[PDB]
A paper describes a structure:
Bacterial HSS is mostly found in α-proteobacteria and in some β- and γ-proteobacteria, including pathogenic strains such as Legionella pneumophila, Brucella spp. and various P. aeruginosa strains, including PA7 and PA14. It catalyzes the conversion of two molecules of putrescine (PUT; 1,4-diaminobutane) into one molecule of sym-homospermidine [HSP; bis(4-aminobutyl)amine] as the main reaction along with several side reactions. Bacterial HSS is NAD+-dependent, active at neutral to basic pH with an optimum at pH ∼8.8, and shows increased activity in the presence of 50 mM potassium ion. BvHSS forms a dimer, with each subunit containing a boot-shaped substrate-binding pocket between an NAD(P)-binding Rossmann-like domain and an HSS-like domain. The cofactor NAD+ is bound as a prosthetic group in the binding pocket with its nicotinamide ring being part of the active site.
More evidence for cation–π interaction as a requirement for efficient catalysis might be inferred from the inactive variant W229A. The ‘inner’ amino group of both PUT molecules is similarly placed near the carboxyl group of Glu210. The ‘outer’ amino group in the W229A variant, however, is shifted towards or attracted by the carboxyl group of Glu237 (distance 3.3 Å) compared with the wild-type protein (distance 4.4 Å). In context of the oxidation of PUT C4 by NAD+ as part of the proposed reaction mechanism, the distance between PUT C4 and NAD+ C4N is 4.4 Å in the variant and 2.2 Å in the wild-type structure. An explanation for the inactivity of the W229A variant could therefore be the missing cation–π interaction, which prevents appropriate stabilization of the ‘outer’ amino group of PUT at the ‘center amino site’ near the nicotinamide ring. This could ultimately impede hydride transfer between PUT C4 and the nicotinamide ring as a prerequisite for imine formation. However, the lack of a bulky, confining side chain at position 229 broadens the active site and might thereby allow increased flexibility of the PUT molecule. This could also contribute to the inappropriate positioning of the PUT molecule in this variant, preventing further conversion of the substrate.
Residue numbers in the entry:
A (entry chain A), B (entry chain B): 3 to 477
The structure:
Amino acid sequence: DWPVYHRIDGPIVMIGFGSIGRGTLPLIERHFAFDRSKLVVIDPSDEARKLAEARGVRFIQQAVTRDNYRELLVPLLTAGPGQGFCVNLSVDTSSLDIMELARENGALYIDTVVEPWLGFYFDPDLKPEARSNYALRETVLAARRNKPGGTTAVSCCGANPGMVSWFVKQALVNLAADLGVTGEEPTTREEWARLAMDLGVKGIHIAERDTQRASFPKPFDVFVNTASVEGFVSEGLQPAELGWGTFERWMPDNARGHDSGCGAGIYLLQPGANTRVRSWTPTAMAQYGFLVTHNESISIADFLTVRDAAGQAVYRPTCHYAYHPCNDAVLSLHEMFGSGKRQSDWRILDETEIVDGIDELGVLLYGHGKNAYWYGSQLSIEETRRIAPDQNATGLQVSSAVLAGMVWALENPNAGIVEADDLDFRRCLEVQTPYLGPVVGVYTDWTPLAGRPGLFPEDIDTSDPWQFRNVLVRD
Amino acid sequence: DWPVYHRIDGPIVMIGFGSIGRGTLPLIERHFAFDRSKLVVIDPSDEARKLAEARGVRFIQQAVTRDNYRELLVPLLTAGPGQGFCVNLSVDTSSLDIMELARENGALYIDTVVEPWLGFYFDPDLKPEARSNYALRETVLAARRNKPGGTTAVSCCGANPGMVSWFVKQALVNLAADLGVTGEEPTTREEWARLAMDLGVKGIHIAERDTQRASFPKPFDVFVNTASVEGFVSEGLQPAELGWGTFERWMPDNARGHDSGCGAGIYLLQPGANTRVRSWTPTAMAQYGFLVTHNESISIADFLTVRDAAGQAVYRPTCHYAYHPCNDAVLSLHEMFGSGKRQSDWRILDETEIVDGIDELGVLLYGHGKNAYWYGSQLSIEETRRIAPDQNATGLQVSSAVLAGMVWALENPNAGIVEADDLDFRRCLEVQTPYLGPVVGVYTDWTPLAGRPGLFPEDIDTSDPWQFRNVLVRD
Ligand SMILES: NC(=O)c1ccc[n+]([C@@H]2O[C@H](COP(=O)([O-])OP(=O)(O)OC[C@H]3O[C@@H](n4cnc5c(N)ncnc54)[C@H](O)[C@@H]3O)[C@@H](O)[C@H]2O)c1
Ligand SMILES: NC(=O)c1ccc[n+]([C@@H]2O[C@H](COP(=O)([O-])OP(=O)(O)OC[C@H]3O[C@@H](n4cnc5c(N)ncnc54)[C@H](O)[C@@H]3O)[C@@H](O)[C@H]2O)c1
């Protein structure tokens, strides 16, 4: 049987019922005990309403907005009898404002992104620095400094950000064993950072290759993806963004830093989904990824920062996304950027439309004595259908991470505002691994200088293959 | 009944029986009178041999090389009783050497590319300039200067290079007529160049969008295309190249000119099939094209050059390819450049494998009073199957162009070495148009500055939207 981890006696408030909400609700019903009538789904769309009604779940057809979120959500979060859980899987809503509302009213909180209120992403009066995920994350860090401790709110606990933070810790443990580095397993952030430094990890790619393909050819003027099209396009049009490692000797002319905050990131004055980087995964081998901004690019680099007494950073890894989405999404990007505007329509691939493929999602640690190491999941669509309904492999890696975060929050309900890097990674992977298919570690001798230089002059750094100067693709 | 244009009174030697040879053979058999035993195909491929046997045509399974071409081709082309025709549709053979051999022996000649002997494209001892199509074309121009007149040899007479030269002439005439400019169309090179100057044509894109889709999804580690994969990859890895207009006021730091030759071209120190440009076609609307090197980028800009009394160029249009290949080819390029090497296998889509689509191929004249004008063919796979066997829409545009050039060569057999810009464009389009489906001219308001600047700073020239500065896709 499937484990029922805990009883939830309070209200379960799910904000948003898109691809991730539809895959997460069945997991919540499977793994927690509660009266089904205590669950409530809020979503503005008719499509979501019909799906919730088909499940006999209470539904409120409203867009949560800055104007209504307090009057709308407080009664739902405080309905009792016990502590409620707010499961935020929406677009167009402020993660920070909803999280602070939940904590104000004693309700647990989890989300998979630091989302702003509608309008932020395309606000023409915002400076590029202000549109960065670094800046949005800094609003969460400030909230934590302002109100330490208290009710647990889990920020950015999906597949990536989320799970990959746990993969980094496991990968560091495996690397220490394989490199003969002795010592006890870290138990504090400082100890984790020092292990990464001692192992010589120069940087980390969130190295992903989605090979799911549809039973129909990509339609003209339709954006196709395996998860949120609105969310992927939004993050893809934000600046390319990365955690910036101490080993880097070069940044492009259009790179910029931040005057304040944790200090772990840079951004480029170009859209991340039109920025290519050289990377590698077990199934793809050498591939292009897109340098799409992601919270974990900053959070992981920040988490693994070592500082001296004066507080200056002496070690920090480079960390960023290196995303090869499904073929139809690759075509959708070429179409969107080539036309200069979003397609007229979009669709997310349903499991019934996917004929084969996997979502290979892992972390690539590089620069150490064994060059590069990839650790992560190779979950296939066939396995997904076997073990979880209403979602594809992309969705299941996300929904199962939300499940793990919820289990952790119930067992640690007064931990304050926390990121995935703050959770107990072993417990979270213990809950999530049944839904991840093959989880494997693979070494490779590939480097970004493989085969280079070619028949054209290239601006490369031959002294250190893994420099960003060698990873970034110029156009 | 199909028209029979001419009797060929000698041997027909077709070098190469790939996608284009297979599409051109039925048109030769359809439109020319000759004894069946006069035609012979030469190709080293076993796949090619079996198809030729099924077609009942003489086949010699041999690679033409520097070492054997004289011993092989001279007897075959001079078998008599009269003038033969060398129809060169191969890869890895020297167009120049074979052309000069055919001419030395009184045989007509046609090809669709200035191909070099095997080894040239990837010779590591060659500078990028020496690997350019500008340089290859200059060998043909020098051969013409050294031996003017003589037997007709048609260089680069496919769809593009080839047919698009005739489209440029027709487009110019249409542009003038659409402005109410009546009277004598030009008859000399200098008059054509002045028509383009007088109408204010700043530049020309060879603006192509292939929408042919396969009945099977893109296989991993397989390069898929609708015509020669080897030929497309070769030119895709040559330097980006363009005819360079007098109106341009900016070029990239890695752009280079030529010390010698006609003077009409620049090249970039980067591969063309990984260089993107902003362009437009009627069915695609705004799209990315790849800036792949092509003979006609130089020959058209050269043809349309106006010089002053001293001999200095005072007007010349920009001209280059803006190629959006079929979706599987787009994915194949992303795969190839992302891995840094050619896929292990490749395949060309057969008409039986194509579910739908067109090859939209035309010329986009811009900078004139009506901004932009696209003229060309919208041939669909469905129409192709009705009018010509053994090829897709891509192949038929090419094979019908070779048919037209062969007709022109037979009708003008003492014209010496000629390019597509040298032929009677009306007669050539008269022969080819039955195979081009819809041939239309479409005006558009679109410019490369549409929607720009976006939310990031960009280096653009707002006073002149069609400047290469605005067309080239840069970081
Ligand atoms: N961390 C990760 O790994 C990860 C992965 C995928 C998605 N995500 C994020 O999770 C979120 C959900 O993804 P998805 O795929 O389900 O998206 P989706 O687009 O499928 O669904 C979004 C849903 O939000 C609803 N919505 C829109 N405006 C709203 C409002 N004002 N209030 C409430 N609901 C509103 C829509 O009606 C829609 O059903 C997105 O923000 C996405 O960026 C994270
Ligand atoms: N101008 C245009 O519009 C245009 C369009 C398409 C192709 N082309 C060119 O036409 C040519 C043919 O294209 P394709 O699609 O048929 O290519 P293809 O790859 O299908 O076929 C090429 C053929 O050449 C043969 N070959 C290889 N080496 C040879 C040798 N030494 N001697 C004789 N034959 C040899 C191969 O066996 C093969 O059958 C290529 O050079 C291509 O670049 C021009």
